[PDB]
């Protein structure tokens, strides 16, 4: 779908700033101890919310996650989310060209319990697109 070029555009808009994180696109990930704290984005949903008899007007949700090793304090995750992701993605004209409406949905934390090999902060947005 457009999700290919949508992911390409959003990752390009992310990488325009200073680097410092791997930008693995989509799902495969596979980190190991070489590509530490990084960002990965993917899509879910894709239902048939019609809401108008002119186009399908499908909708889905994007999940972008920041992964940091071990048990780093949550302040680092807060700062990284607020500096590297939140403002830069706030206004991307290309995405507005590809989709109709972009709206933030959620932003949560999680971390592994057995040996705690990772600690991720997830951000999910809601997207309305036509296909």
């Amino acid at each position: 779908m457009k999700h290919t070029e949508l992911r390409a555009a959003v990752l390009d808009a992310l990488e325009k700033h200073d680097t410092g994180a791997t930008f693995f696109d989509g799902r495969p990930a596979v980190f190991d101890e070489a590509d530490f704290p990084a960002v990965a984005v993917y899509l879910t949903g894709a239902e048939y919310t019609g809401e108008e008899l002119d186009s399908d007007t499908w909708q889905a949700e994007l999940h972008i996650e920041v992964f940091l090793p071990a048990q780093v304090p949550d302040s680092e995750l807060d700062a990284w989310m607020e500096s590297r992701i939140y403002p830069v993605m706030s206004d991307i004209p290309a995405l507005s060209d590809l989709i109709t409406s972009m709206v933030a949905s959620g932003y949560d934390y999680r971390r592994d319990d057995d040996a705690g090999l990772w600690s991720s902060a997830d951000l999910t947005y809601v997207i309305t697109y036509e296909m």
Partner: protein
């Protein structure tokens, strides 16, 4: 030395297995600052999958060092395995003659206590 008749044999066995098994790890930083110890290092492999595919395959280093040489080791300070450097994430209680030092890689993440 100690009213055991058994912990003496335990300590002798521990010294022998340190001598015949393991490597010399030198410590940096902390109250011990620079010091050299002998310990048996192992690194089992552990993998977590989290979401759809988030394979973060890593390692869980352990050293099994005698408590006497690592008294008040704290946690914030780092450690070096020869050319490689680590940082103590946790210390097990002594079983009678020694304990286990569980290590993480890289630099310890901040302090985050006050």
């Amino acid at each position: 030395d100690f009213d055991n008749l058994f912990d003496a044999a335990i300590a002798r066995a521990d010294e022998t297995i340190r001598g015949y098994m393991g490597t010399s790890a030198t410590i940096t930083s902390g109250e011990q600052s620079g010091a050299v110890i002998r310990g048996v290092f192992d690194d089992p492999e552990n993998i977590s999958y989290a979401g759809q595919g988030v394979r973060v395959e890593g390692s869980s280093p352990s050293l099994f060092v005698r408590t006497d040489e690592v008294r008040q080791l704290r946690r914030g300070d780092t450690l070096t395995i020869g050319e490689e450097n680590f940082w103590v994430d946790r210390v097990s209680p002594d079983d009678g003659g020694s304990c286990h030092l569980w290590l993480g890689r890289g630099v310890p993440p901040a302090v985050n206590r006050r």
